[PDB]
Design an enzyme around this catalytic site. Sequence first.
Site, mmCIF file in Angstrom:
data_model
loop_
_atom_site.group_PDB
_atom_site.id
_atom_site.type_symbol
_atom_site.label_atom_id
_atom_site.label_comp_id
_atom_site.label_asym_id
_atom_site.label_seq_id
_atom_site.Cartn_x
_atom_site.Cartn_y
_atom_site.Cartn_z
ATOM 1 N N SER A 46 63.390 -15.279 -28.218
ATOM 2 C CA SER A 46 63.863 -16.411 -28.922
ATOM 3 C C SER A 46 65.247 -16.558 -29.106
ATOM 4 O O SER A 46 65.692 -15.546 -29.536
ATOM 5 C CB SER A 46 63.087 -16.441 -30.346
ATOM 6 N N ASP B 204 65.956 -26.728 -34.909
ATOM 7 C CA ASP B 204 66.082 -25.456 -34.924
ATOM 8 C C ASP B 204 67.354 -25.031 -34.081
ATOM 9 O O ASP B 204 67.331 -23.931 -33.586
ATOM 10 C CB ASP B 204 64.775 -24.692 -34.189
ATOM 11 N N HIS C 165 66.124 -19.975 -36.618
ATOM 12 C CA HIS C 165 65.237 -18.878 -37.336
ATOM 13 C C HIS C 165 65.507 -17.743 -36.600
ATOM 14 O O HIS C 165 64.652 -16.687 -36.978
ATOM 15 C CB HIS C 165 63.590 -19.406 -37.314
#
Length: 930
Positions: A203, A96, A67
């Site tokens: 992230s 992910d 993402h």
Amino acid sequence: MDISKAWARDYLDLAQNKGVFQPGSTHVKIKLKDFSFPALPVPDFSSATANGAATSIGGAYAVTVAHNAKNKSSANYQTYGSTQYTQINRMTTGNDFSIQRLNKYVVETRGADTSFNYNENNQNIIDRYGVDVGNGKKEIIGFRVGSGNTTFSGIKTSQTYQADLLSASLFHITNLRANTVGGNKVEYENDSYFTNLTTNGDSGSGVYVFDNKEDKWVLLGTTHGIIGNGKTQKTYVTPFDSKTTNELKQLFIQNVNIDNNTATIGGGKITNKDLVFSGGGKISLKENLDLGYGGFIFDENKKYTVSAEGNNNVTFKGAGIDIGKGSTVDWNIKYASNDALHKIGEGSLNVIQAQNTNLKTGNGTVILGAQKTFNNIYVAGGPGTVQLNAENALGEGDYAGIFFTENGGKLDLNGHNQTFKKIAATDSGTTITNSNTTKESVLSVNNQNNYIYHGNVDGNVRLEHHLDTKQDNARLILDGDIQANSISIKNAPLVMQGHATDHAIFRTTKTNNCPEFLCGVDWVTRIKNAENSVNQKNKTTYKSNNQVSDLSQPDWETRKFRFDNLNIEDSSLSIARNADVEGNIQAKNSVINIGDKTAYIDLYSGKNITGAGFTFRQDIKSGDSIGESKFTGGIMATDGSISIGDKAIVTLNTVSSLDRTALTIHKGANVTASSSLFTTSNIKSGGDLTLTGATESTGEITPSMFYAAGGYELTEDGANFTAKNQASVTGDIKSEKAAKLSFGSADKDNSATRYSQFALAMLDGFDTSYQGSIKAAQSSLAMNNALWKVTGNSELKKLNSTGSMVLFNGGKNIFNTLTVDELTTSNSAFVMRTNTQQADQLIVKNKLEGANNLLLVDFIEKKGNDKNLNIDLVKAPENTSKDVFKTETQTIGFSDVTPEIKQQEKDGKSVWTLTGYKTVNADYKAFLAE
């Protein structure tokens, strides 16, 4: 980031492998405003993207989180060093996970280790990656590096994805298998003291964990998200996924089995994926080949040639060239000219023709077999070698068209001579060498302005800094290790010094691109203010001043400078702080400052390469910065001058010859000369100066030598001047400070003499001779077995002669007076002269003498019998006693003339007089045990 305990720069130093956090550093601790990092080596974080959001996995591959696609790229556009890479494919997992294919092979790093196996049971993972934190208690500890929205204890930089701000987190794993949406994920919590909490911009960043048995840092996975807020904030890591990784990698393999034959390529056919060649053989191109996102990959231990059909002109373009260990690829085409050739892998690219393009190499060997082989070369990452193999193989311009970023690589001149105006090296990962043991390479560096070479030299090289005209500002400064056959300097200065350890900074541009309204004081300034108090009390403002290093910082790397010979003509040689210098110096009309106070730093040290990696920046500051320095060897000089400064430690163990060459030893220097030193000039010394026989030659054993100083030696402070161990010292010594010492080994010797006893006709004993005039009216003088022949009027303050001692010599009927102020002679020797009616010497003024002793005499008048006239020999008023020259009826003397003495005369001055004569390897020290 919490900077209540730790300095802000500390998190940055760790992430960027700066300061104390060099890769592999064990037992690291940092002072707090005290903290010990875990007993592991520091990771190498160079596989991280500049912005931290992804991690290189080697070659064209990288790993991040899925993402992060939605994020402003964050991971679609990757920078390593001076190179930009683009994700052109990927695979993605419900948990992910993201494995990425980049458009070109990464040159800067070999990538992170991918041997983490999430599918092992919990106990196996704990035992493989667990860390002892006390009494055998295992916890899985690890590090994470990234550059999210950055904050320092409530100081908001509002900066995201800044490479300068790349910051490290230390953590312990709180759940190996956390049940989240998407699948099982590793959960961690930060250290409560060294606390860098995860932000959104983090992230995707890589999470590292350390394998117990293989002793290596391993990529655990990539950062997925957080839950919570402060100290106990949890972070979730998407575990690295081999299966999905390997499936993406399968999309780019086309095996080409050449097997020593010839593979012909053109028209979309072989007679994009990577072309993975195996078996060795020849590769022939019938036309330009553009592999798009693919490139050339070669297996191990094989020979390949890449040729144009019919000697035509064809170009190759693609992802790059990856050559396996033990293989050589003869590259006889051009790489395309609008693209950089990216070379990785451990094997050899042998470039037979000029390329008219740029090279970027990070591994193995690239051999330049042609004139101007590449236009510009960029060397990155550490383990690559560039090797010259033709005349004028390097490029044009001040830097000879080669540039070494972070961790650098090797330039092997390979028997060739190469000249640089300047070497464009960012750090001591760079070395210029010469592997050819039979033909020496001359390396010329002829900068006309201040320039610092941060890299090294070793192998079969000679280094020259020659200019046509005397230029005092053309300072060549060496910051790295230098191992050279010889070094020659003409008309332009050389400086050898240590290297100020590089640290991370917060921002390298000096502006803050946000207006003062809505943003106020610069966050850079705010960090400096917020840490000002603790910096003022510890005197460590260098930690928060946003400079890469500081002249006043204490952390300096000591550098080795070794050479058979340095020659200097008409310029100056400076050895400054933290240089360890060894070899012989020949100097002509030149200045030598050993332990010079001026040191140089580079404001872009460690980040000197810019643009696409073919431009170089440097900004030099200098100032006082005093630290230990070492010179060991010998000095042959004509004119100029020599200076030895505070904290320098000099060892002259090679014969030194100074002609009209003044030597000044300043306060705080230690100079030991175990080798002969002759000088037609003088030596001034306010430090420690020690002169000794050659205590070398054998693993034991000592032979002797000489020290002449025609202009005498002069002492300048409460200093030390020591002569001992078979030292023969000529030349007067004067001083008007409270000085000390020494002549003669202070009980470190005896009578058991080694060495040539024909080399004893130069010192008799003792093991020390001096001559012979001391004008020091405040100074001490130890005398454990010596002494001098005394050639002049000496007015000395204090004197202690436990052992053999002074005689007089020897001006033509020119008589002299010694004069002490606490002459406590504890034994023999005091031979004085006179002709008959004219005598000298009125010694000790303020008494206190010793036991035994021997006050003697001798002549030039042929008194065939006695001559019972009145001529005194000392002048000590009243005196403590009298038996301080006891009656020993055994005097050889000079000739056969033996007069006697007295006990007292004129007032309290207990003098000595004279009488008549007698008749009586065959000796002076024939009276040590008397």
